[PDB]
Each structure stands twice: as C-alpha cells, then as structure tokens.
Symmetry: C3
Subunit: 369 residues, 3 copies
C-alpha cells in the first residue's frame, strides 16, 4: 500500500540506527609510482550495512623543469583521482564518475568546501593546522610539493538516511571499489592546453612528474545489526534503492542558442552540476546568457542569469564553485519524469569556442528493480 511499506522502512531504519554499532576502519593502503600503474581495485569488508568509503590520497609532485614553474589548476588536488566506480555484492554498479564531480558533490552535501578550514578573527589558534585537503599554489622549477586530498564515496545518502546503503553479507560478494589515479600524462597541462583534468599548469609542465602517490581507504559501516522476532530488522526500501553519482559529456553548443541536456526517466535527480569547458577556457559566467531547468510543457522553472544562478549556490555552499562550474540543488523535489526528457538542463551560451562542451554530473536515486 506504499504508505504502509514506507512507514515500515522508516521504522526499521531508526531501529537500525538506534541499535547498530557504527564503525569506520581502514580497508587498504598503498603507495605507488604513476609511471608503473595508476588503476587499482580495493576490496572492502563484507560486514553489516556499508555506508561509504573515505579515500585519503597523498602525493609528492616534482617540477624537474630547469626554469619554469607550474601553478594549480582550478580543480587542483581534486584531480588526484581521475575516476571512481563501485560495484556492490550483487555486481550492480552504484557511483561511476570523475574525481572532481565526486568532490563537488561532497562539498554540496557538506554545505561548504568539503573538509575545508574556515577563516575567522579568532585569536585562539584554530585554523589550517592539519592540512586535511591541501596543495601548494605553485611548484617552482626544481621544487617538490606535497598534496593531500580526501574523497567520500557514498553508498548511503547520509549518516541518518540509509537510502542507498549496502547490506554486505552476500556470499561470493563481488564488491569492489575501483579507483583510477592521475598520472604523468593527466596531472600536468602545458600553457594553452586544456586544464580540466590537470592538477598543475604552467611553462614547466612537460618536466613535472609524480615522485609517488599514496592512498588509504577507510570503510564506514554499521555492525551489530538489530534482530527482531522475524529476524534482522532492516529498511528494505533503503537497501533496495541505489544512490549514485554519474557523469556525461555533451557537445554541440552554438552562441545565443538554447543547449538542452535531457534528464533520463526513472531516475530521481537530487542535484545537477554542469561544467562549461569552453574549449579549454573556463569563465566566470561571462560566456553565458543564462542557465535553467525546464519541462517542455510548462516553460522554465528557473531561467536565471549567471550571477543570480550563482546566488542560489552561495546559499547552498556559502561560496562559489570554481569558474565555469554550475550547480543546481533539487534535493527537496527531485527531478523525476517518466518519459525520457520531460525535463532538461539548459545553457544558452553567449560565446562558444572551438571544442566547447558541457561536462555533466548527476546525483540520483533509483530502484535496483
């Protein structure tokens, strides 16, 4: 009766939260040289209800150029991880997206730059003491810089909403977290080249290289699951729902013409990110007339100029996302059609360079079956 089942799921959820034992433990650590390999498979533990994975990444970058330096790109350390893919025990894929998109969602969900240290007038020495997410603004010719990055790969939606979580007990569990890290070919961009996927860009890029990269994965899950008269108490709707992040690329933009990216049906899109990679140039709204979301049945529900669009985002993350990165929150009322494309994301560009494209990022809920 729907109402019945949901009432049941929410109760089981609260019981699990009340009774279960929350755990966060290291699953794997490794150090390597991107020259030899940059793709890895992490095999998590199959215990209780898995909520997500915290991925710590550290790296040492050396600028072996004789005289030219390099400087952080807009995404910087967020590109330490190129991509991520998660397969659950039943071999069903959840998240499959880029590291930068995953990072922007982590920020969006936190309500501020993910794991950042806010600046205040406090005389007591709070501040960037621990360099949790950190990277030198520039790496001079001959210097070696150290970076630290953190990503949260979510299964469950949040700490108190287990929608998307994974019950890990399935024997012959095909559960695996795949990570592709940056390498000497993706991390550094030459002057004039596209900085989208790079970590550093500058005149000394050609001679920049990784001294090494290291990662540590922590798995977060709930143990000591509650058991009722009928057995283990579990929110069946939560555990049978997928909460994923995915990315896609779109091209074919033309000045002053509405570029529309349709949302697929069945998916409940919680948020949308659109990056205007204007042929390797990323501008602060100046190459756009407006953005919007619209149902080709009731016009636009939010056709806004770039700054006003940015204003809404400032209400969500207390600052702006990097240049050319646009965010759209639909958490309270997810974009959910039924007919592929009853709703679309719109960008009417003011100027379009050669090789322009929109790099899309989505956050959504969907049923396993």
């Amino acid at each position: 009766r729907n109402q019945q089942a949901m009432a049941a799921n929410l109760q089981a959820r609260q019981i699990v939260l009340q009774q279960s034992y929350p755990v966060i433990q290291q699953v794997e650590t490794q150090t390597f040289d991107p020259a030899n390999r940059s793709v890895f498979d992490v095999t998590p533990a199959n215990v209780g209800i898995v909520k997500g994975f915290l991925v710590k990444v550290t790296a040492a970058i050396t600028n072996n150029h004789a005289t030219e330096a390099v400087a952080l790109t807009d995404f910087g350390p967020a590109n330490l991880v190129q991509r991520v893919i998660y397969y659950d025990p039943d071999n069903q894929r959840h998240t499959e997206t880029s590291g930068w998109h995953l990072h922007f969602v982590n920020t969006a969900k936190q309500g501020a730059p993910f794991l950042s240290s806010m600046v205040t007038d406090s005389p007591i020495k709070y501040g960037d003491v621990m360099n949790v997410i950190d990277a030198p603004a520039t790496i001079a010719a001959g210097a070696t810089g150290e970076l630290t990055m953190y990503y949260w790969v979510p299964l469950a939606y949040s700490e108190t909403d287990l929608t998307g979580a994974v019950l890990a007990n399935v024997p012959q569990s095909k559960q695996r977290l795949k990570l592709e890290f940056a390498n000497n070919n993706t991390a550094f961009a030459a002057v004039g080249a596209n900085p989208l996927e790079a970590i550093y860009q500058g005149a000394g890029a050609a001679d920049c290289e990784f001294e090494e990269i290291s990662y540590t994965v922590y798995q977060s899950y709930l143990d000591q699951l509650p058991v009722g008269q009928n057995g283990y108490i579990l929110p069946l709707i939560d555990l049978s729902t997928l909460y994923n992040l995915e990315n896609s690329a779109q091209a074919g933009l033309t000045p002053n013409v509405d570029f529309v990216v349709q949302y697929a049906n069945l998916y409940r899109y919680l948020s949308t990110i659109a990056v205007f990679d204007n042929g390797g140039s990323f501008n602060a709204g100046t190459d756009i007339n407006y953005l919007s979301q619209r149902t080709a049945n009731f016009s636009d529900t939010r056709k806004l100029d770039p700054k006003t669009w940015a204003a809404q985002t400032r209400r969500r993350i207390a600052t702006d996302f990097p240049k050319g990165v646009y965010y759209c929150d639909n958490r309270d009322k997810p974009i959910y059609t039924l007919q592929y494309g009853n709703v679309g994301f719109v960008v009417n560009p003011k100027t379009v360079n050669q090789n322009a494209r929109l790099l899309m990022g989505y956050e959504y809920f969907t049923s396993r079956t």
Copy 2:
C-alpha cells in the same frame, strides 16, 4: 477552542500546498537607467498563484570624476543602492515598507551569515569569490570607474517552509506593486564630515562622483499548480491572512547616561529588532553606549547587556558583527507581543550623545491584515 481548530487546519493546508505545488522563480522585469533622470520605479509583478517573495538584482557603474581625490565605501556600501522598498498586495494593503539597508540586514539575519557572501577557507580547490554576487570596489580612485552588484530579497512569506505572510496573487485587474526607490547622485555620495548613513561612497572626491547607470532585474518567487481539494483549492487561510513585514522608524532625544526607551506597539508580534545608533553622523563600535536591553513595564530587563556581550549574542546568530553602530536582537522563538506580556520597550542607555543623535529602528513582525 475554535482557534486550535483553525491553526491545525492552516498547518495541514500549508503542508499540502508545499508538498503538492512546485517552486518557481522567473524574471518579471529588467531596466537600465541613469539615476539623474529617474530613481523611483513601480514594478508590476505577475499574479500567478501564491507569491513568496522577490529577489532583486541591482548593478551599477560609478565614476569618480574628481581631479585628485578618491572615495571609499561607507559601512553600508552597496546595501544603499536601494534607498527604499515598499510592497502592496492585490488588495493594495502594504506589507514591507523599509530601507534598503534594513532589508539587507534582515536578509543577513535570516541566512545566518552575511547575505549571499562568499566565505573564505583554506581550500586549494578554487572555490571563492568567483561570481561576485554581491560586490563593490573598496575605493574608487580619481578618474576611475567602479562596478557594483547587489541583491535584496523582499519577503512576503516568512520562509521557504513557513508561508506565513505569503500573498495569493490571482485577483485580475488588481495586481501587486513593488516600489523601489534607488540611490542617486545626491544620496550615494557623502562628502568628508557628512553623514554616511545612506551613502555608498564617502571621501574628498565625493562631489564629483556620479552614476554612469544603474540596472535592476526583479525575479518573482511563487508556488505554481496549487492543490485543489474536495472543496476548491486547499490553502492555509491563516498564513495568507497574516502580514509579514519589515518597517523602520527614527527616534531622537537621547541623553548621556539616561535610558532611551522605544516602546513596541501592541498587536504586532515582533520577530526581530534592529537599532542603529546614528550618533550625529558618527557610527561607533559600541563605545558610545553604556548598555542595551529589552524590558517590561515591571522594569524587569530580560536582556540588560553591555555592548560587547550584546554583540556576542549576535555573533551566535550571523557568525560575525553587524556594521558599526548596528545592533540586532532576535525574538523569533518568543515574539515580543504586548498585552500578552505587557508593555515592552527597546532600551539604549548612551554614554556619548553628539548633536543630532538618533536611533534608527528596524522591525520585523507578524500581524493580521484584519
């Protein structure tokens, strides 16, 4: 007990309209003008359902034509691009009628931080002031031209989840009216020694400063596709019959070491109070005040506090201090309501009182349109 019946129903209807209707925000009007020609505009919004509020974008290009002197932002700066804002619902009933700076301070108070500001952090990823949503050059040098961007949210509804104060705009031949009085070459620039209260820039070059142009764009936020029940549209009749307004006033007659009391009228439920101590054109960081308070006829004093402790209370509210001479008081959980707590007043016992000292009061309150 009929009241307990009405409220319960109003709440239910609110929940239903929120769940059933879909949020919409669309541009209603945009214009570029020279404030030398005109500065007052009457914007006619569309009557398309339940209106929650208006987001007003304002931009401007200001040139300092002075041969040698510069000008610097006043404490309120771009918040003074709009001098006054007045809203009239379809029934020509007035809701908000306040100054741009007061409206802006309330936007800040409601957000829990400087309105639409970009917080500074240690993040290496390039977040930050990328889009300059609310922006203005700290100074405008002689011969230079500066650009500014400002935003104001004119509320009807109290919030996104509490439709108290929202307006049902569906009355044909009787639309709403959003009156905007903008800054001009007379109000925006204060000479050295002049009162900067309403100015944007002040300095030795003020006399030669002028707007090149000002532009504004009004966005209307409303709820469309209202839910219709077994008996017509289901609506929270109490929310829609309540006025949520911002208003301001001025008070004079302060004496050193004597309690200056400003009575709160009766019938109104005051959610917040702002008091600006315009000390004869001087705005001080609490040093010209002995203490502030909110007291009842019983000479109680539920909040008699020294300036810094009062400010501490505000820091818990918006994570920082309001500009110099601006004092905030939050009464959102237990609104000041005389005749249900007795007569109440806002108190300021000044330490120093210059010539032409006055207290500019800003109020945020609820009241029945009947």
Copy 3:
C-alpha cells in the same frame, strides 16, 4: 520495567512545558576589576531564581610588556587561558563542572560548531567583520607596549537552550550556589622561550618582564523565569533537574613510542565528548608525533582507528576548522560512551615520538546522576 520509559516521556513533556511557558532571562550577577597581582581567586554568588541554565563570563584584561627589547607572542590557546579554572556548586553543594578555561572554551567551540563567538571572514563589501572584538587579543605585544584582551566563557549547567538536562532549580533560600573562578596571574600568563606554553597567554623572549595592569570580569546568569505551575504544582522535568552535565579534565602520563597509550573511561558516566591534548614535553605538534588515535572497547574494537589527518577530518566536519596544534577532539554526542553498555572503553593514542615529560591532558564532557 516500562516504568522508566513512562518516566522519560513525563520528563520530556515537563521540559517542553517549561520551555514554552517560562521566559528566558540573562542578567548581570556581578562585575569586578582587579590586579591579579593582588588577587586572582573569586567566589561568585549567583542569584537563586527559577531554573539556572548557565553563566556567560566576560573577561577583559590589559597586559604590559615592560621588557627592554624583546616582544612576546600569543600562545596557541592565548586569551582562552585568562581563566585558569572554573568550578560550580549548586544549592545542595553538589559539584558540577570543574575544569580549565581552555577545556571549557574548546567545548564552547565544539557545541557552537565553530570557534566560539568568532567572526567569520567573507567577501562581503558591506562592512561586517570583527567590529565589536568580542573575543580578541593582539598577536604580539612589543617591548614597551600595552595590549588589551577580551574573552568570553559559557559555563553550562543545562546541556543546551532546548535540552534542560543538567539545569539547576535554585529556589532554596539560605542555600546559595557557588561559581568559583581562578584567573591567570603574572606567573601563569607568561612563558619564557622554551618553557611549556600550555597554560600561558603570551610566550617570548620578553616574558620575564610582562605583567597584568588589570583584569576585569562580568558574570551574567542565564535562567528561566515564571515557571509554570499546575494542579500538582510546578511542572518540572525531574530527570533533567536531577542529572548532572559536567566538564572535567585530567592528566595522563607514561607514553612510549609505537606503543598504544590507553586512557580508560572510568564510566558509569555518559561521555558526550573527549578532548585529548598531546603535551609532548612542552611542544605541541600538528599530528606529526602521532601514528594514530582511536576509541576501542573490551574486544579488539577500534570503532574508529585513524591516522591524525583523517581524525582531523572528522573534527573539521564538527567545527569547520582544526583545533590548535596537539589538540584532538572526539564527538560521541549521539551515542555517549557508557562502559556498562559495552564493557570498558578506552581512548587510544599511539605516539610516533615521545619527548621528556610527555603527557595527555584529557578533557571530558558528560552526564551523570546526582544519585547513581
């Protein structure tokens, strides 16, 4: 029996009724200006009225560096060390909080979710900012200069504005409360180069000739007035008012490199949060002297065994920044440490390097019954 669940519901309702019917009040209790060289310990006598929730203590000071050439600079804790210790006793003379100024301040911060009463920096052109200098102190005081400081502390009884657990009913005349404050003096506030800066406010080569010109405080008492009275009398949340919410701190020594240092939770208490300061022989490091930290139970638990940076990450989610160097925080608010719920539990720190006189200063925040 379900008699407890019934008692809890009844308590909660009384709390709701009290929060809705009574009116919150904050009023000055007393102000005093003095030279810590003359006196530094004060017993404040709060007024007995309604339900007391806590005290906001404002502290200001003027410090003069009279060295001939050397200046001094704020230590990591700085003005948080203006008050060395705070102790509260209710009307029945039952002791509640008893802790250092720095621990209390760090808890104030944790509860706020940001540096206590700080002013956040933003790009806003409107002149918001550090206007009123609520908590403030000059980064340095040059030789011959005089600096001014302002500090605030919230001494809680009640857990929060909405949770009256730990509050105090003060309607017993001839039975006064007691708020003892021990302030910093010329001995505790200044640390010489190389000395331990833990409890100091300023440290530097000019420390020997630094002295307070004066210190001043103002205690404000926060309470609920006009308590609701019903058929059977005053409606009161009996469990809230008979529960103690306290902060305390202790020191622990005996750390060895690469060996797990375990501080057992001498429970029976419901530990809401834990702060561990790694005073590594007078030097405070940004996690570089620690292999990992964690909380573990009887078994081989390790509910959260983490390297320093990841441990710091959890805290960044809590207070939007890091606590000062060598200060580690652990939030257990939703599921308090209670060793009777899962055997003994301990806070663990496996040090990478241990200097001479190394120790862990533990700060606890907890609930406990006036009668257990």
